[PDB]
Amino acid sequence: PVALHCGKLFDARSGRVLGPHTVVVRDGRIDQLISGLAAVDLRNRTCLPGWTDLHVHLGDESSPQSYSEGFRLDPIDFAYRSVGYAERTLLAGFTSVRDLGGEVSPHLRDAVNQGLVKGPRIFAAGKS
Amino acid sequence: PVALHCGKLFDARSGRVLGPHTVVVRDGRIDQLISGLAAVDLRNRTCLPGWTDLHVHLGDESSPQSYSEGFRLDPIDFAYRSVGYAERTLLAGFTSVRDLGGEVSPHLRDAVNQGLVKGPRIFAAGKS
């Protein structure tokens, strides 16, 4: 249970930036929204809903050696990179993503859901 | 049948450069060697026996992409390069070589012996 005090709130549904509000969070869901318990001082910030990226590939990254690494590396080697990929994606403000290709992403989603590693909520497509 | 007129001849066995000589060739072998028929004017050159390279790999050549080409190319693709490799080796003065690795070299040797392509006499090792 925590109360967030924002100086400005972005209304996604109406697309307008409102004034100061207070958000009360209990059991991982928004419980109350007051216009006007632990507390976080955000009164000098703008609060928005977490962003969603609808096209990512968390199991890979482009590089000069990406066209010869597939014949020498294993997916287990790519998982250890995906750890940092997912952490960096989450810390940038994207709380959920849609993974659209790759067999490493379902396993990363399971690990993130079990709390083993940090990352966003993953909707994985698997093999294209 | 041709007669070669050299201004100087290198005696490999004694390791000394002799004076003008005449070499008569019949049936692919040296028939006569005279110190002092078709004719070739070499009187302003030094004649030596053909050279032998005891370590070559005629089926390949080093390049920046040589560590990723093996997974995308076939030996048939390497034969077409070996054609030029063998021609360039022969035209440089090396009439015979010892190939010490590679499965393309026995086929190149057979093709050269049958007269299909130009090259040196190949003693091929095959797979190491």
Question: CA–CA separation, A43 vs B112, rounded Å?
Answer: 84
Residue B1, amino acid: P
Question: CA–CA separation, B34 vs B30, rounded Å?
Answer: 11
Angstrom resolution of this structure: 2.4
Q: What is the DSSP letter of A14?
A: T
φ/ψ region of B104 (left if φ > 0, alpha if ψ in -120 to 50, else beta) reads alpha
Tell me, rounded to whole angstroms, the distance of Cα A58 from its chain centroid.
12
* Block residue for tokens 């959920």: A96
Residues in B touching A72 (Cβ below 8 Å): none
The HSE-up count of residue B65 (CA atoms within 13 Å, CB side) is 6
Based on its alpha-carbon atoms, the radius of gyration of chain A, rounded to whole angstroms, reads 19
What are the tokens at B13?
């066995």
Give the distance from residue B66's alpha carbon to the nearest chain A alpha carbon, in angstroms. Answer: 11
Q: Which helix (H) or strand (E) holds A113?
A: helix A105-113
Q: What is the largest CA-CA distance in chain B?
A: 60
Q: How many CB pairs under 8 A join A and B?
A: 6
Q: Taking CA atoms, what residue in A is nearest to B66?
A: A68
Question: CA–CA separation, A22 vs A5, rounded Å?
Answer: 5
Query: Please, which residues have CB within 8 angstroms of residue B20's CB and are 6 or more apart in sequence?
Result: B5, B6, B7, B8, B9, B35, B36, B43
Task: Decide if B35 touches A, using CB distance below 8 A.
Answer: no
SS3 A58: coil
Q: Which helix (H) or strand (E) holds A26?
A: strand A21-26
- Sheet with B94-99: list strands edge to edge: B51-56, B94-99, B121-124
Question: CA–CA separation, A18 vs A14, rounded Å?
Answer: 10
CB B102 within 8 A of CB B60: yes
**Is B71's CB within 8 Å of A68's CB?**
yes
Interface of A with B in 57-86 (CB under 8 A): 67-68, 71
Q: Taking CA atoms, what residue in A is nearest to B69?
A: A68
The candidate with the shortest Cα–Cα distance to B118, out of B93, B81, B90, B97, is B90
Burial of B60 from C-beta contacts in 10 A (0-12 / 13-18 / 19+) = middle
CB B103 within 8 A of CB B89: no
Question: CA–CA separation, A108 vs A124, rounded Å?
Answer: 9
Beta bridge partners of A33: A23
Burial of A77 from C-beta contacts in 10 A (0-12 / 13-18 / 19+) = exposed
SS3 A115: coil
- What DSSP string runs through chain B? -EEEEEEEEEETTTTEEE--EEEEEETTEEEEEEE--EEEEEEEEEE-PPEEEEEE-TT----TTTTTGGGT--HHHHHHHHHHHHHHHHHTTEEEEEE-S-SSHHHHHHHHHTTSS---EEEE----
Q: Are strands B2-11 and B38-47 parallel, antiparallel or unpaired?
A: parallel
